Design a protein that fits this description.
Shape: globular
Largest sheet: 2 strands, parallel
Number of strands: 4
Radius of gyration: 13 Å
Structural class: alpha/beta
Order of helices and strands: HHEEHEE
Helix content: 10-25%
DNA sequence: TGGAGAATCCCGGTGCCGAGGCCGCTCAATTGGTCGTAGCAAGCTCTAGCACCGCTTAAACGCACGTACGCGCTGTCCCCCGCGTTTTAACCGCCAAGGGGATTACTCCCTA
Protein backbone atom coordinates (compact mmCIF):
# COMPACT_ATOMS: atom_id res chain seq x y z
CA UNK A 1 0.00 0.00 0.00
CA UNK A 2 1.07 3.57 -0.68
CA UNK A 3 0.30 6.54 1.56
CA UNK A 4 -2.81 7.16 -0.56
CA UNK A 5 -4.64 4.02 0.56
CA UNK A 6 -7.89 3.24 2.43
CA UNK A 7 -5.95 1.83 5.40
CA UNK A 8 -2.40 1.12 6.53
CA UNK A 9 -2.47 -0.48 10.00
CA UNK A 10 -5.30 -2.87 10.83
CA UNK A 11 -6.04 -3.81 14.45
CA UNK A 12 -7.96 -6.93 15.35
CA UNK A 13 -8.93 -9.19 18.23
CA UNK A 14 -7.44 -12.67 18.51
CA UNK A 15 -11.12 -13.71 18.41
CA UNK A 16 -11.55 -12.41 14.83
CA UNK A 17 -8.34 -13.68 13.19
CA UNK A 18 -9.84 -17.07 14.10
CA UNK A 19 -13.47 -16.34 13.23
CA UNK A 20 -12.75 -14.40 10.01
CA UNK A 21 -9.76 -16.67 9.22
CA UNK A 22 -11.18 -17.49 5.77
CA UNK A 23 -11.02 -13.77 4.93
CA UNK A 24 -7.63 -13.19 6.56
CA UNK A 25 -5.84 -16.06 4.75
CA UNK A 26 -6.93 -14.48 1.43
CA UNK A 27 -4.62 -11.49 1.98
CA UNK A 28 -0.87 -10.87 2.13
CA UNK A 29 0.56 -8.98 5.11
CA UNK A 30 3.68 -6.80 5.00
CA UNK A 31 4.23 -7.02 8.78
CA UNK A 32 2.53 -8.61 11.78
CA UNK A 33 2.41 -7.74 15.49
CA UNK A 34 0.97 -9.97 18.23
CA UNK A 35 0.31 -8.21 21.53
CA UNK A 36 0.41 -10.44 24.62
CA UNK A 37 1.78 -13.30 22.54
CA UNK A 38 1.31 -15.49 25.61
CA UNK A 39 -2.08 -15.89 23.91
CA UNK A 40 -0.25 -17.86 21.19
CA UNK A 41 1.68 -19.96 23.74
CA UNK A 42 -0.36 -23.15 23.12
CA UNK A 43 0.27 -24.97 19.83
CA UNK A 44 -3.09 -26.77 20.09
CA UNK A 45 -4.90 -23.41 20.13
CA UNK A 46 -6.79 -22.42 16.99
CA UNK A 47 -5.32 -18.91 17.23
CA UNK A 48 -1.88 -20.49 16.98
CA UNK A 49 -3.00 -22.82 14.16
CA UNK A 50 -4.72 -19.92 12.35
CA UNK A 51 -2.05 -17.23 12.72
CA UNK A 52 0.64 -19.79 11.85
CA UNK A 53 -0.88 -20.12 8.37
CA UNK A 54 -1.23 -16.41 7.65
CA UNK A 55 0.77 -15.27 4.62
CA UNK A 56 3.10 -12.74 6.24
CA UNK A 57 6.63 -11.53 5.55
CA UNK A 58 7.68 -10.59 9.08
CA UNK A 59 6.20 -11.20 12.53
CA UNK A 60 6.71 -9.85 16.03
CA UNK A 61 5.59 -11.62 19.16
CA UNK A 62 5.28 -8.83 21.71
CA UNK A 63 5.19 -10.27 25.22
CA UNK A 64 6.33 -9.49 28.72
CA UNK A 65 6.18 -13.05 30.09
CA UNK A 66 7.57 -15.38 27.43
CA UNK A 67 8.51 -18.43 29.47
CA UNK A 68 5.11 -19.25 31.00
CA UNK A 69 4.51 -22.77 32.29
CA UNK A 70 6.58 -25.08 30.10
CA UNK A 71 9.32 -25.44 27.48
C1' DT B 1 -82.31 0.38 -23.43
C1' DG B 2 -79.66 4.26 -20.89
C1' DG B 3 -77.10 6.18 -17.67
C1' DA B 4 -74.44 7.44 -13.99
C1' DG B 5 -70.76 6.12 -11.05
C1' DA B 6 -67.93 3.11 -9.22
C1' DA B 7 -64.56 -0.54 -10.24
C1' DT B 8 -60.85 -2.27 -13.19
C1' DC B 9 -57.68 -1.57 -17.01
C1' DC B 10 -53.54 0.26 -19.15
C1' DC B 11 -50.01 3.22 -20.08
C1' DG B 12 -45.91 5.66 -18.65
C1' DG B 13 -42.57 6.93 -14.85
C1' DT B 14 -39.60 5.70 -10.98
C1' DG B 15 -36.58 2.66 -7.94
C1' DC B 16 -34.56 -0.82 -5.90
C1' DC B 17 -33.00 -5.12 -5.18
C1' DG B 18 -32.47 -9.40 -6.32
C1' DA B 19 -31.15 -12.35 -10.10
C1' DG B 20 -27.45 -13.72 -12.96
C1' DG B 21 -22.58 -13.76 -13.56
C1' DC B 22 -17.70 -13.61 -11.83
C1' DC B 23 -13.82 -15.38 -8.78
C1' DG B 24 -11.33 -18.32 -5.28
C1' DC B 25 -10.84 -23.00 -3.40
C1' DT B 26 -11.74 -27.03 -2.15
C1' DC B 27 -13.07 -31.12 -1.53
C1' DA B 28 -15.58 -34.34 -3.44
C1' DA B 29 -15.89 -36.37 -7.98
C1' DT B 30 -12.91 -39.13 -11.09
C1' DT B 31 -8.82 -42.29 -12.54
C1' DG B 32 -6.62 -46.66 -11.67
C1' DG B 33 -5.95 -51.13 -9.18
C1' DT B 34 -7.33 -55.00 -6.02
C1' DC B 35 -10.46 -58.50 -4.08
C1' DG B 36 -14.63 -60.58 -2.80
C1' DT B 37 -18.94 -61.82 -3.94
C1' DA B 38 -23.44 -61.93 -5.48
C1' DG B 39 -26.57 -62.64 -8.68
C1' DC B 40 -26.82 -64.71 -13.18
C1' DA B 41 -27.11 -69.07 -15.89
C1' DA B 42 -28.31 -74.39 -15.74
C1' DG B 43 -30.43 -77.93 -14.09
C1' DC B 44 -33.90 -80.53 -11.15
C1' DT B 45 -38.40 -80.94 -8.56
C1' DC B 46 -42.92 -80.93 -8.13
C1' DT B 47 -46.34 -77.21 -6.70
C1' DA B 48 -50.35 -75.23 -7.70
C1' DG B 49 -52.35 -72.82 -11.49
C1' DC B 50 -55.22 -73.86 -15.41
C1' DA B 51 -58.61 -76.44 -18.07
C1' DC B 52 -62.63 -79.42 -18.22
C1' DC B 53 -66.95 -82.13 -16.81
C1' DG B 54 -71.41 -82.92 -14.16
C1' DC B 55 -74.63 -81.92 -10.53
C1' DT B 56 -77.03 -78.78 -7.09
C1' DT B 57 -79.38 -74.68 -5.65
C1' DA B 58 -79.51 -70.62 -4.40
C1' DA B 59 -78.73 -66.17 -6.33
C1' DA B 60 -80.21 -63.39 -10.22
C1' DC B 61 -83.74 -61.21 -13.00
C1' DG B 62 -88.07 -59.92 -15.42
C1' DC B 63 -92.31 -57.72 -14.18
C1' DA B 64 -96.31 -56.44 -11.22
C1' DC B 65 -97.68 -52.67 -8.31
C1' DG B 66 -97.88 -49.61 -4.83
C1' DT B 67 -96.66 -45.90 -1.92
C1' DA B 68 -93.02 -43.70 -0.12
C1' DC B 69 -90.00 -40.19 -1.17
C1' DG B 70 -87.93 -36.56 -4.63
C1' DC B 71 -88.70 -31.87 -6.35
C1' DG B 72 -90.75 -28.09 -8.01
C1' DC B 73 -93.58 -24.26 -6.22
C1' DT B 74 -95.22 -20.68 -2.62
C1' DG B 75 -94.44 -17.86 1.43
C1' DT B 76 -91.66 -15.73 5.08
C1' DC B 77 -88.32 -13.78 7.28
C1' DC B 78 -84.23 -13.21 9.44
C1' DC B 79 -79.85 -12.85 9.16
C1' DC B 80 -75.80 -12.16 6.71
C1' DC B 81 -74.14 -8.34 3.10
C1' DG B 82 -72.75 -4.15 1.91
C1' DC B 83 -71.14 0.32 3.22
C1' DG B 84 -70.11 4.27 6.56
C1' DT B 85 -68.05 5.37 11.17
C1' DT B 86 -65.14 4.35 15.08
C1' DT B 87 -61.02 2.26 17.26
C1' DT B 88 -57.31 -0.73 17.84
C1' DA B 89 -53.52 -3.00 17.21
C1' DA B 90 -50.67 -4.92 13.44
C1' DC B 91 -46.49 -3.58 11.38
C1' DC B 92 -42.09 -1.37 11.57
C1' DG B 93 -37.71 0.54 13.81
C1' DC B 94 -34.59 0.76 16.91
C1' DC B 95 -32.19 -0.65 21.14
C1' DA B 96 -31.58 -4.19 24.79
C1' DA B 97 -30.52 -8.58 26.95
C1' DG B 98 -28.72 -12.40 27.68
C1' DG B 99 -28.13 -16.78 26.49
C1' DG B 100 -26.28 -19.97 24.42
C1' DG B 101 -21.93 -22.05 22.49
C1' DA B 102 -17.19 -22.58 20.99
C1' DT B 103 -12.34 -21.42 22.33
C1' DT B 104 -8.88 -20.99 25.91
C1' DA B 105 -6.87 -21.59 30.59
C1' DC B 106 -4.99 -24.90 34.29
C1' DT B 107 -5.16 -28.55 37.69
C1' DC B 108 -5.79 -33.56 38.56
C1' DC B 109 -5.71 -38.56 37.44
C1' DC B 110 -6.81 -42.22 34.21
C1' DT B 111 -4.80 -45.18 30.90
C1' DA B 112 -1.65 -46.74 27.52
Amino acid sequence: YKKDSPFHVMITSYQLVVSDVAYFQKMKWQYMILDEAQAIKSSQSSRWKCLLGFHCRNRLLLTGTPIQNNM
